[PDB]
Structure 1
């Protein structure tokens, strides 16, 4: 039920960037694999800031913050901080949750290897928490469908923080991640497309990064691939 898709064109997209990558697509029926390094789909990597999705769910569910709270620096909300790079709001939230509640929630959700270690404010960037791209697409598909074991309102509020782009009636939700301080570097873009008729198609892009690459390379590869697959 996890099968290589029609991959002759998308494979070349990753080759052209001179790196190894996979794109996992989950529909209501199938999981398909694309890219030039399909073994990445079942390989565990640190989640990097893709973990912000679960951090926000845990923090909101346990009333450690709310969507209107202003975090002092600009000063900003949890939702404003979701899409921003190198902001400490999510480290502060992790400290409020605390190691014990964070580990209990991550174990209850079963996210990746579900190991957070002893440092509550960085385990998603350097380990020991790791997750495969297949696990990430399954997690984000559950979020999109309001099927995670959290409040419906909490799931809706986190989904609203994840809107990336809208065009031509399609909404693209998701979250970037880049673990730059481990070797090799790991890049993520995990999320879903809400098509005009309401159908949901979830994705997880995972690729090796290098320091000279523009951050936009992940979105660039994602959009070209989703177009080739007629998902947008």
Structure 2
């Protein structure tokens, strides 16, 4: 069911990095990773939590639809793209933490906790502050657990409405061309060691879907582009994308 391919480690070491890529072939129900241990080690989800958070906010009516405007609160932050109005699409594109913090406050502890249990999401533990637990609280998720969750979302099998799942998958749209579609979400965890970057999502082909989840050590922000670059080098090696 699971195959370890350490030849992918070259893609990390050539960039003076360490990490894990996990791939799942939906047609064949077979998984592949360079590091079975790290594939099952649990990390803070950081901004990858914007996927479940969006689903919960939509299903409870905290977010009406993907056009609703969340007005900038007028507090200047160090990420320029955060100092503006956003909707669900742009808030996910730019990983706009303060918008999702407000979602979490309106969701509340009780409903957030139950919904994460219904999703079987990671360790399902929201210990910490309700507006930051995915950044510095007790919640943890592994790369293999990200894949399990994403497969449910792809098949509209999560315990929220079909509409909520369709909207979040629209908001995850990252890249599309004549060869593939990528729906994904980046993450960057810095408040708790080890600092890591995430990229989780899937690649849609004409006749198959390949789910992926990667994380990697991220001692400085200088290496953030490697999250997508390393993943795509693996995808290219496996002839999933040209």
Q: TM-score, normalising length from structure 2?
A: 0.89
Partner of 1:217: 226
Partner of 1:83: 93
The answer to whether the aligner puts 1:20 opposite 2:18 as a matched pair is yes
Partner of 1:112: 122
Cα distance, 1:16 vs structure 2: 1.2
Aligned partner of residue 43 in structure 2, secondary structure? coil
Partner of 1:58: 56
Partner of 1:177: 187
Partner of 1:69: 68
Cα distance, 1:118 vs structure 2: 4.0
Cα distance, 1:84 vs structure 2: 0.6
Q: What is the rounded CA distance, in whole Å, between the counterparts of 1:19 and 1:86 in structure 2?
A: 27
Partner of 1:150: 160
Q: What is the rounded CA distance, in whole Å, between the counterparts of 2:18 and 2:158 in structure 1?
A: 31
* Contact 1:21–1:207 (Cα < 8 Å) also in 2: yes
Q: What is the rounded CA distance, in whole Å, between the counterparts of 1:139 and 1:122 in structure 2?
A: 21
Q: What is the rounded CA distance, in whole Å, between the counterparts of 2:173 and 2:96 in structure 1?
A: 19
Cα distance, 1:86 vs structure 2: 4.5
Aligned partner of residue 88 in structure 1, secondary structure? helix
* Contact 2:122–2:140 (Cα < 8 Å) also in 1: yes
Show structure 1 runs of 5+ residues with no match.
Answer: none
Cα distance, 1:227 vs structure 2: 0.8
Q: What is the rounded CA distance, in whole Å, between the counterparts of 1:11 and 1:30 in structure 2?
A: 20
Cα distance, 1:201 vs structure 2: 0.9
Number of paired residues? 227
Aligned partner of residue 213 in structure 1, secondary structure? helix
Partner of 1:192: 202
Q: What is the rounded CA distance, in whole Å, between the counterparts of 2:49 and 2:11 in structure 1?
A: 27
Q: TM-score, normalising length from structure 1?
A: 0.93
* Contact 1:82–1:162 (Cα < 8 Å) also in 2: yes
Aligned partner of residue 140 in structure 1, secondary structure? helix
Moved over 4 A (4+): none
Partner of 1:47: 45
- Indicate which of 140, 161, 166 corresponds to 2:171: 161
Q: 1:127 to 1:2 in 2, by over 3 A?
A: farther
